[PDB]
């Protein structure tokens, strides 16, 4: 269009920039460590939250608790992120029940570790790519229509240090490549969607979660590589999700927030 | 050690993590666009602010206004950042006056554009390195002592997109290299101050300040490179400075926050 | 077992380091611009070459021309890279016909451009990931066995500037993702395969092949962004492939060679 | 509209691309491990070489021996890279004695290690910056004139993994930041000089030279971080320097060749 494009009117108050009042956020892996923490940050900011889950229990009860706690709307939705159909239906259910969708957090993830050789099953590769990469694309694709119609939107993917670093001692090229794919996929989206949305990623290091250090051997690697000598606590991501989800970050697009206690420094 | 290092207690509330109450932040370039915006964010979070300036007028008046606005202590200090003695003295004055120093924001910057050839004065090169790079080292060196004695601290340097990309059409290798040096200097400090401080950088794209686009030619490059088709407003750096300065970001260290409206996506 | 690992015995002659005498190289996209250029480089260096193609015509005669021109063995193999069985069968045919496999160049690529939209078919996404990413995984999976049996190998993937920047004016997140994925997949393999092989990528900018600038609007961007103001000529990639394929690069692993005429600088 | 710019004269033979016959290369740190290896690669390719040294003994003999060995012209020059006049004096002498200057390799380096705190002398910071960063600027400044007159040139800086990662266990933010500075300074020159020169860097990991692993604690870090479990041998750099100095790399500008045995992967 004509240049320069309009600078938005912006709150004089930094805390007001963080407000999620009147805004709707959907979060996959909603029942998990990072996902629920993000939900708590956003619910505290006054935002309504859709918690998307697959196998997590008590989600209706956990939703009701979060809603009561913060005085916002929280509803849980079953969503199998490897299935486009399920990803789409969850998004359209959120749009229908809430009236809009301002933020999608593609936070569900997983995969299967292993060296690359003929002992690595072909399905292990594709399940891994499906859960981290294809899932993000299925969500983005459908969000694109909502965000374009609203003229606004914020897409966040939870990536990993594995997108830029190679995990040791348990090789996992599949998971590493799938997360790197997401990082640059989101960057491409930031340009693609420049007229109606921002797109950013958060790359956590090791966090105290069921997806954190699997055993003593990875813990020992963590204590050496993390300059802080410890795994993160999920509260330490809360502000970063809220930062990207809100008007705190209206000039932040195509960015990857590295929250890793210095893991990637050495 | 031992390992794991202890987690740091954090409030249950995401907004309480941003609180700067009881904490002291010193900010060079404190009379300037980005530096005063940062000061406003920190004062809003209840933090005390030392405003470090060189030639900016009415700093005593502007400091008192900010103090009254937010109900915090604000005091200005003359500091020439290319002189280690001036940098050291301002740091020691704030330490003496406020009793502590929790966050130093190495935000002052400048330099001289020009192609690298025999018409580029040696002093231009050295003034540019002094104002961006040496200044930061001078600050870090004296902050190290205070942070180590406190066992806590947050060091922030304002870098630039110029640390990772090359500006056009006006060549400025000196400025670009000086900002790249600061980004990795800071990354080096994050490992080095491990036991007592976090250190991070904020890399703005072009912002509407006296250091924003030189002329129409730079403007035209910005309008097509930035996917948002405009320069930033310093309000949109505010939340990022507070993020890093506070307990919002306790597992964030060695990071470079890119806030560039997509300039670097390409 | 113990450290340090043995330093390889190497020629005093730098030109001898480039020799591909007694080495077998397999190259997907072998009938294409970049792939045949690399074949010419390796044939000249005295290497035997397996040319892997899908639809390219006259491959038996082109192979014959190359073999005669350079006095090496050259054979063509039909290989559809989106299918694991065809990738594996080609690799195993080469191993049998040539007796060994020293270097594999995962050079075939493609994809479907387009904005991420409900108008972007799921099939287009998966076709794009298949030809660039899955293909590379399928080759690597099978090479791992040969390479470790041998105690040596060099895996090379042709990536793109699209791995690290986003292409304009024609959005293509699928392709950009898939190439980013390959870059870090190869980095993960470099660690994975550390005892028996080296793994590196070459990321070309725009080159004059059928995969080069698709129209005048892409050309105009290229002229602005490449500091050299032109597309590459495939001869300008030849040395980089020979460098990685040979003993010229025995301490080079996990690297991404950017050959882009400065496309990524600004 | 002089776009597109003509593609240079490109040898059809990959080995002819590496030829340095009729080309003059000046190498600081010429008496050192990497520098002399670079000189041998370039002498073998038929290039004339100026060995620039500060304190290295027997340089007149070592030059004469390299010249006789390869049948090229080799001369030595006393050059203190921290002083602009000495850098310029050596450049102008080379130009006068050899007639030309096609390639400058800013290879000299050093510095003083240490944590950043009041015990790190201001002089130590400035020495470190001078030897790595300012030296490179001093060379570039004067090379620009020669390259402009020639319409051609290849500027190479020897950087380090330290430009991209943080060394451990012995902190060295000064050295790290200076090297990072040089990487992006070079990237900036690649654009600046785009009409008459190419500009690239080579980032070695630890190599077996007096600037290699200082003690067994560094060695132990090296053996666990580099996937090849050993320090580099200087022969393993030769081909990379030749690659950048010659027509092997005519579309390669603004690139950083990482040659680190995978040190930066994990
Ligand atoms: N913790 C760590 O050390 C790190 C984590 N990450 C990333 O953070 C994200 C969240 O993980 P985290 O909270 O740590 O761990 P959790 O195990 O607590 O959460 C992971 C979530 O992924 C969901 N999930 C997995 N597969 C599917 C699927 N097929 N369909 C729908 N949901 C699925 C799970 O849902 P459910 O339980 O309902 O089945 C679960 O809630 C992941 O993307 C992970 O890759 C990145 C770096 C580090
Ligand atoms: N605006 C932009 O587009 C971008 C700016 N930046 C960086 O942001 C930072 C702040 O600049 P910004 O706020 O935009 O512009 P301003 O011009 O408003 O601020 C620049 C500040 O630097 C101070 N300064 C310059 N030289 C010295 C010196 N020798 N000693 C002490 N102070 C000095 C000035 O202080 P005083 O007036 O008191 O002399 C001034 O406050 C700089 O580091 C700049 O490099 C990075 C990317 C983009
Ligand atoms: N040219 C450019 O500007 C750039 C190209 N690249 C990459 O370089 C590589 C080579 O392309 P380039 O030489 O430029 O272009 P070409 O079109 O000349 O060659 C591309 C090759 O890809 C092969 N191919 C495509 N799909 C398949 C498939 N499904 N199975 C087997 N082979 C397949 C084609 O084989 P066939 O014809 O036999 O069917 C063809 O030989 C690609 O990976 C591309 O992504 C990267 C950056 C820039
Ligand atoms: N070896 C390694 O592990 C690594 C080395 N590097 C870099 O490689 C480059 C070469 O080092 P390398 O060959 O390994 O080690 P050497 O010690 O063999 O070489 C270092 C060279 O730098 C020269 N030098 C130092 N200070 C000055 C000065 N003030 N003026 C002129 N010359 C000076 C020395 O010259 P003289 O003897 O004549 O005084 C010497 O030839 C350096 O830039 C270093 O930073 C980068 C990564 C790793």
Automatic annotation (TrEMBL), chains A, B, C, D:
Family annotation (InterPro entries): NAD(P)-bd_dom_sf, Sc_DH/Rdtase_CS, SDR_fam
Keywords attached to this entry: NADP, Nucleotide-binding, Oxidoreductase
Pfam families in the record: adh_short_C2
Biological processes, Gene Ontology terms: carbohydrate metabolic process; small molecule metabolic process
One MF annotation (Gene Ontology) recorded for this entry: mannitol 2-dehydrogenase (NADP+) activity
Residue positions binding NADPH: 33-34, 54-56, 80-81, 107, 109, 175, 179, 207, 209
UniProt entry tagged with the keyword ATP-binding: no
Domain of life: Eukaryota
The UniProt record lists the keyword Nucleotide-binding: yes
Family stated for the protein in its record: Belongs to the short-chain dehydrogenases/reductases (SDR) family.
PANTHER family referenced in this protein's UniProt entry, alphabetically: BENZIL REDUCTASE, CHAIN DEHYDROGENASE, PUTATIVE (AFU_ORTHOLOGUE AFUA_4G08710)-RELATED
This protein's name: NADPH-dependent 3-quinuclidinone reductase
Source organism of the structure: Rhodotorula mucilaginosa (Yeast)
């Amino acid at each position: 269009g004509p240049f320069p494009k309009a600078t938005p009117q912006l709150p004089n108050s930094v805390f007001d920039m963080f407000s999620m009042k009147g805004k709707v956020t959907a979060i996959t892996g909603g029942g998990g460590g990072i996902g629920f923490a993000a939900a708590e940050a956003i619910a505290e900011a006054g935002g309504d939250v859709a918690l998307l889950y697959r196998s997590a229990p008590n989600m209706e009860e956990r939703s009701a608790e979060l809603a009561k706690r913060f005085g916002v709307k929280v509803k849980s939705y079953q969503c199998e992120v490897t299935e486009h159909e399920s990803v789409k239906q969850a998004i359209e259910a959120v749009e229908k029940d809430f009236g809009r969708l301002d933020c999608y957090i593609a936070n569900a993830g997983g995969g299967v570790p292993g060296s690359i050789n003929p002992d690595y099953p072909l399905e292990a590769w594709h399940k891994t790519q499906s859960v981290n990469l294809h899932s993000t694309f299925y969500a983005a694709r459908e969000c694109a229509r909502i965000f374009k119609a609203q003229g606004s939107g914020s897409f966040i993917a939870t990536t990993s240090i594995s997108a830029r670093i190679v995990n040791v001692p348990y090789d996992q090229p599949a998971y590493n490549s799938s997360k790197a794919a997401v990082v640059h996929f989101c960057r491409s989206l930031a340009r693609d969607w420049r007229n109606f949305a921002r797109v950013n990623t958060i790359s956590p290091g090791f966090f105290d979660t069921p997806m954190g250090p699997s055993d003593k051997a990875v813990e020992d690697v963590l204590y050496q590589k993390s300059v802080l000598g410890r795994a993160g606590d999920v509260k330490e991501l809360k502000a970063a999700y809220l930062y990207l989800a809100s008007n705190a970050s209206t000039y932040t697009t195509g960015a990857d927030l590295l929250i890793d206690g210095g893991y990637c420094l050495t």
